[PDB]
Swiss-Prot record:
Name the record gives this protein: Conglutinin
Residues forming coiled coils: none
Domain of life where this protein originates: Eukaryota
Glycosites: N88
Subunit annotation: Oligomeric complex of 4 set of homotrimers.
Species whose genome carries this gene: Bos taurus
Complete-protein stretch covered: 250 to 371 of 371
Protein family membership: Belongs to the SFTPD family.
Length: 122
């Protein structure tokens, strides 16, 4: 089961993984990491984060061009919900090229080595 908005379904099994491992899990399941493109999609992801009590990865990253967060298509964001002061590319100074979502629905850029809840979209 999962949470759905329109034709998109978000699912989790409560796995917690690094970004690269999370991406692999979703792809092997024939989906991709959660990619909220609207307020309504963001709220569905947020509900799951609240339930699981763990920040989740989103798909988007700025590994290609620093500060330009893109989907797995390489396209720029059509929606964002950054927490106040984010994205800051600064884990106590160190680069942050991946994105986590909080249980309040706001986003923070993080090191892609961080271990976070895996939510996939289908
Ligand atoms: C690894 C991690 O999640 N670090 C976060 C950083 O990303 C965020 O910008 C900062 C805000 O003050 O809090 C923590 O340092
Ligand atoms: Ca960055
Ligand atoms: Ca940050």
């Amino acid at each position: 089961d999962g949470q759905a908005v329109g034709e998109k379904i978000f699912k989790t099994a409560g796995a917690v993984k690094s970004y690269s491992d999370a991406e692999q899990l979703c792809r092997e399941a024939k989906g991709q990491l959660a990619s909220p493109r609207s307020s309504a999609e963001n709220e569905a992801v947020t509900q799951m984060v609240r339930a699981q009590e763990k920040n989740a990865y989103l798909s988007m990253n700025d590994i290609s061009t620093e500060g330009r967060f893109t989907y797995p298509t390489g396209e720029i964001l059509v929606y964002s919900n950054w927490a106040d002061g984010e994205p800051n590319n600064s884990d106590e100074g160190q680069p942050e090229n991946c994105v986590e979502i909080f249980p309040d629905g706001k986003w923070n850029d993080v090191p892609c080595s961080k271990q976070l809840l895996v939510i996939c979209e289908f």
